[PDB]
Amino acid sequence: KLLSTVLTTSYSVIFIVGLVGNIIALYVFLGIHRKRNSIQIYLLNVAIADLLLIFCLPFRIMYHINQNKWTLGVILCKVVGTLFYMNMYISIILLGFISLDRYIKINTTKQSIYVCCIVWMLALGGFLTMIILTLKKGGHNSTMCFHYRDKHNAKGEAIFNFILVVMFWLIFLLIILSYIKIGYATTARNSFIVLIIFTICFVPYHAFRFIYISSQLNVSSCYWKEIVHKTNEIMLVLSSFNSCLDPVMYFLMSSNIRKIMCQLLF
Numbered sequence: 001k002l003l004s005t006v007l008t009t010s011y012s013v014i015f016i017v018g019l020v021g022n023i024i025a026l027y028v029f030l031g032i033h034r035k036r037n038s039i040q041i042y043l044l045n046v047a048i049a050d051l052l053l054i055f056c057l058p059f060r061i062m063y064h065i066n067q068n069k070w071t072l073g074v075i076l077c078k079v080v081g082t083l084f085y086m087n088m089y090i091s092i093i094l095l096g097f098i099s100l101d102r103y104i105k106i107n108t109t110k111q112s113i114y115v116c117c118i119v120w121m122l123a124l125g126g127f128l129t130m131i132i133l134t135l136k137k138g139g140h141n142s143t144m145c146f147h148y149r150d151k152h153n154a155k156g157e158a159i160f161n162f163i164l165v166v167m168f169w170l171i172f173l174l175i176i177l178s179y180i181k182i183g184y185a186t187t188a189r190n191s192f193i194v195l196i197i198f199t200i201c202f203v204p205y206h207a208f209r210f211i212y213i214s215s216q217l218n219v220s221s222c223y224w225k226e227i228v229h230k231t232n233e234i235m236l237v238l239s240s241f242n243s244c245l246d247p248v249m250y251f252l253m254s255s256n257i258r259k260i261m262c263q264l265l266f
């Protein structure tokens with residue numbers, strides 16, 4: 001109903017804007033650059049991950065068009081879920097490294113390539129392990145995805161959520177202390193953009209997860225879980241907003257983005 005239609009509109013607009021921005025940014029990064037120290041590599045991989053999320057969005061949009069009905073199987077459903085989170089976590093780790101990298105400057109290249117390549121292999125490995133468990137179980141083909149599921153007998157799965165939510169806080173914690181130390185004019189202003197994106201899109205999402213996981217391992221009334229279900233779907237949209245806050249971040253990290261954007265606007 002109302003929740004479905006607001007999600008449809010928000011997802012449509014976010015997909016369009018993110019697609020345009022990521023396409024332009026990826027074109028500029030791929031077709032102009034010859035020598036890259038570390039920032040170009042980091043921003044290129046961030047652009048690729050954003051492109052992945054943008055290409056994943058239309059399936060969820062179509063799902064919300066059809067009044068919450070799924071008719072394409074289970075494998076596609078789990079592929080969509082896996083890709084969405086996967087991009088969420090890649091974006092949190094590679095945005096961490098840009099700050100850590102952009103602090104030694106104020107206070108070479110082969111090391112940044114090593115870290116950059118490791119992240120993609122572990123994300124790819126985690127993609128495969130979700131497919132294998134889907135085929136093995138091979139359960140009845142239910143028509144209900146993107147919906148609340150209970151984990152009363154699946155406490156191990158709650159541990160997957162439990163590890164991530166706490167681990168995100170250390171990454172958020174270290175970024176704060178890094179800024180405090182730092183807290184040259186251009187460098188200081190730019191690094192403040194990293195904190196803006198990190199605090200708006202991602203910080204709210206993990207905070208409410210404590211209540212969400214708490215209701216999972218507990219008995220809940222009819223009123224309670226409906227409100228929790230209402231909150232999470234809206235709460236995910238805020239996390240998916242990083243696809244459009246990243247393009248403005250490209251603008252302040254390099255002049256090539258600035259020059260092409262200036263050419264297009266002028």
Ligand SMILES: O=C(Cc1ccc(OCc2ccccc2)cc1)NC1(C(=O)O)CCN(C(=O)c2ccc(-c3cccc(Cl)c3)cc2)CC1
Nearest residue numbers: 078081082085086089090093115118119122123126127130
């Ligand atoms: O960026 C990543 C990969 C990563 C790689 C290395 C890391 O440190 C090593 C390292 C760090 C810095 C430098 C050098 C080395 C840390 C993370 N992120 C993942 C993770 O390891 O934290 C998490 C998402 N991920 C899934 O496979 C995945 C999970 C959960 C779901 C899911 C959850 C709920 C519902 C549903 Cl349906 C699905 C889906 C997929 C990839 C690995």
